[PDB]
Design a protein around this ligand. Structure first.
Ligand SMILES: Nc1ccn([C@@H]2O[C@H](COP(=O)(O)O)[C@@H](O)[C@H]2O)c(=O)n1
Ligand SMILES: [Cl-]
Lengths: 115, 112
């Protein structure tokens, strides 16, 4: 089972259902099960990386791809007033799934501070 | 159009610089929202993430890798939150793309 056995690894292998927005060879975008904004989705690599703090230098292109896919999906979903992208790292970040992911939230005014 | 982040990159006004290389700059936010709150910005003037090009992929990822390394150097061993704001709903404050890195306290949910 490539990609590991976190919930996200299982979603990648189609073993647990998800509402998928976009998929390519490097990543997957799907809606969050507990949305914090009218639109709230995740972009995740297919390669298993536990958290941003252990990403390798050679992961730069992949991490950037998450953002490019995030912004493209946001446009496809009509978030024309903007959105917020978030990575939660570790305990202080509130991380609950240890497979790297980018949140994209929009469809309402986001506030400051960002939590 | 030029922004205050352009002035910071050009060293025309001061900032507390954490790290610099040939393609990005990291510096403490002047209005910090956590005990540690810094920005990583590209030297290339991309106004907002929504207009970033495919060729910018590795540069954007570089911001994140630099951010993670700076976070470690600043002792954020308990974690942190990275944020990119887009447009008015995103609360984007400066039209030069920037990655926020916040830590040194519990970050809460929702993220704004
Ligand atoms: N089956 C699941 C389990 C979690 N999730 C979402 O994954 C996200 C994980 O983000 P954090 O690791 O930053 O908490 C949460 O927003 C959670 O609602 C999901 O969308 N589907
Ligand atoms: Cl901002």
């Amino acid at each position: 089972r490539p990609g590991g056995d976190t919930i996200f690894g299982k979603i990648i292998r189609k073993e647990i259902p998800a509402k998928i927005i976009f998929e390519d060879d490097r990543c997957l975008a799907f809606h969050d099960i507990s949305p914090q904004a009218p639109t709230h989705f995740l972009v995740i690599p297919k390669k298993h990386i536990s958290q941003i703090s252990v990403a390798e230098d050679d992961d730069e292109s992949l991490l950037g791809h998450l953002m490019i896919v995030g912004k493209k999906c946001a446009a496809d979903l009509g978030l024309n007033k903007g959105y917020r992208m978030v990575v939660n790292e570790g305990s202080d970040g509130g991380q609950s799934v240890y497979h790297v992911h980018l949140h994209v939230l929009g469809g309402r005014q986001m506030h400051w501070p960002p939590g």
